Structures are given as C-alpha cells and as structure tokens.
Amino acid sequence: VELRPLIGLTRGLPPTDLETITIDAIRTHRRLVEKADELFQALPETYKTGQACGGPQHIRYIEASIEMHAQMSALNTLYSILGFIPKVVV
Amino acid sequence: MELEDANVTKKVELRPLIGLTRGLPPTDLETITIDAIRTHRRLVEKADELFQALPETYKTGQACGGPQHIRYIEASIEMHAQMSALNTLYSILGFIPKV
C-alpha cells in the first residue's frame, strides 16, 4: 500500500462508492498523463533528451509529471483496498 | 532559501521525483518545492472545510456514502497524494524550507 492513510479514510464506505471513486481515479490519471505528454512534446529537443534542464517551461512539465505520479500512487492504493482493477472503457 | 527545519527524516515516497528533478538548478528545485508547499496548504484547507461541512452524522461515523461524502474523500485523497510528493521533495532537498 503506497498511501496508507487512504485505508482509514475509506473505511466503512459502501463498495459501490469505492468502485466509483476508483473509476474516476483511473479517468483522472489518464487525463494527467495526456497533459504531461502534451507538455513534454512541446519541450525543445534538448530538454527532451536531458541535455538541458531548468527554466519555467521545463518546470511546468515537471509539475505536471509530479501530479501524475502522485495520482498514480493513490490509484494503486485504491486497487489494494478495492481488491481489484475495475473494468473501464478507454 | 530560508530554512524551516534542517536534517529532515527523509522519506522518499514518490521515487520518480528523484529522476525528474535530477540536474535542476537549485533555485528551480526550490521554486518547485515552494509551490508544492502552497499547494498542500490549500489542499488541507479544502479537505478540512469539506469535512466540517459534512452533516454531523457523517463526522461521527453514524452515516456514510453518497456524493457529498465521496467529494470529501476525493479531496482528502488528493491531499495525501500531494503530501507524498512534498515529503519526497523534502528528501531531495535535505531540508524543509520556510514559506
């Protein structure tokens, strides 16, 4: 379990609400990844290969990626608490 | 930048941040952390407010479920998740900044 506090937070919640939260969390993650991808694609080549780093544009991409990773950690936790990955149409 | 607490008990909670921030100018890692600090404070305020707005039956645990409850939970999830991020940035910096 990546984010332990979610155990206690979701304690007692009806299983349909847990599933619902988890499905919405899948949708959010995918939206976050698409955003992080978009910003990455717009970076100059040099930042893409790691030759250069820093500056506002690169920081914005980094921030988008952090949000994506933080979310994924939550999502993985939700899977452990739910007991499954729900079927979601992509 | 201004330091709040030195020699932190580093918990690297979100591994990918290390590679993300590798090589940044120190000023840029500090700008990231500061904005993460401000973000976290914000998320806490929102989750705490949503909690206080719940009907007293939900706060006591006499009731659960439904859209309002879910909304509090999701806000809370976002707060915990962002705090995992922030604790990792503190590990990378080696200190907690004052903001």
What's the maximum distance between 2 C-alpha atoms anywhere in chain B?
51
Instruction: State whether B85 and A70 contact (CB < 8 Å).
Output: yes
Burial call A25-49: b when 16+ CB within 10 Å, e when fewer: bbebbeebbeebeebeeeeeeebee
Under DSSP, the state recorded for A2 is -
Going from N- to C-terminal start, the domains of chain B cover: 2-99
Judge: B25–A66 Cβ closer than 8 Å, yes or no. Answer: no
Max distance between CA atoms of chain A, in angstroms, equals: 50
Do A87 and A27 contact (CB within 8 A), yes or no?
no
Q: Do A9 and B80 touch (CB under 8 A)?
A: yes
Resolution (A): 1.8
Closest by Cα among A38, A33, A30, A17 to A90: A30
Within 8 A of A75 by CB-CB distance, chain B residues are none
User: Long-range contact list for A52-59, CB < 8 A, 24+ apart?
Assistant: A53/B23, A53/B24, A53/B25, A53/B28, A54/B23, A54/B24, A54/B25, A54/B28, A55/B28, A58/B28, A59/B28, A59/B31, A59/B32
C-alpha pair distances (Å), B65 with each of A29, A81, B54: 23, 16, 11
Q: How many CB atoms lie within 10 A of CB A1?
A: 12
**CB of B35 closer than 8 Å to CB of B14:** no
Per DSSP, A4 falls in state T
Q: Which residues from A are below 8 Å from B when comparing CB atoms?
A: 2-3, 5-6, 9-10, 12-14, 17, 20-21, 24-25, 50, 53-55, 58-59, 62-63, 65-66, 69-71, 73-74, 78
The H or E element that residue B95 is part of is: strand B95-97
DSSP assignments along B33-90, one per residue: HHHHHHHHHHHHHHHHHHHHHS-HHHHHTS---SHHHHHHHHHHHHHHHHHHHHHHHH
Nearest-CA residue of chain A relative to B64?
A: A13
Other residues' Cβ atoms within 10 Å of the Cβ of residue B44: 15
Residue B47's nearest CA partner among B78, B68, B84 is B78
The backbone torsions φ and ψ at residue B88, rounded to the nearest 5 degrees and listed phi first, read -65, -40
Closest CA to B36 of B52, B14, B6, B55: B14
CATH no. for B2-99: 1.10.287.160
**Assigned architecture for domain A1-90:** Orthogonal Bundle (1.10)
Nearest to B85 by CA among B16, B4, B7: B16
Q: Which two tokens stand for residue B43?
A: 């998320």
Which residues is B5 bridged to in the sheet?
A: B96
CB-based contact A21 B74, cutoff 8 Å: yes
Report in angstroms the alpha-carbon separations of B95 from A62, A87, B3, B8. 20, 42, 7, 6
Query: With contacts defined as CB-CB under 8 Å, which chain B residues touch A54?
Result: 23-25, 28
